[PDB]
Amino acid sequence: GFRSPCPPFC
C-alpha cells in the first residue's frame, strides 16, 4: 500500500 506522499518518501 504505497502512495503519495507517504510512504515511503515522507
Experimental determination approach used: NMR
Residue with cell 506522499: 5
Residue 10 and residue 3: Cα distance in Å, rounded?
11
Task: Give helix then strand counts, H and E, for the chain.
Answer: 0, 0
Say how far residue 3 (Cα) sits from the centre of its chain: 4
Residue with cell 515511503: 8
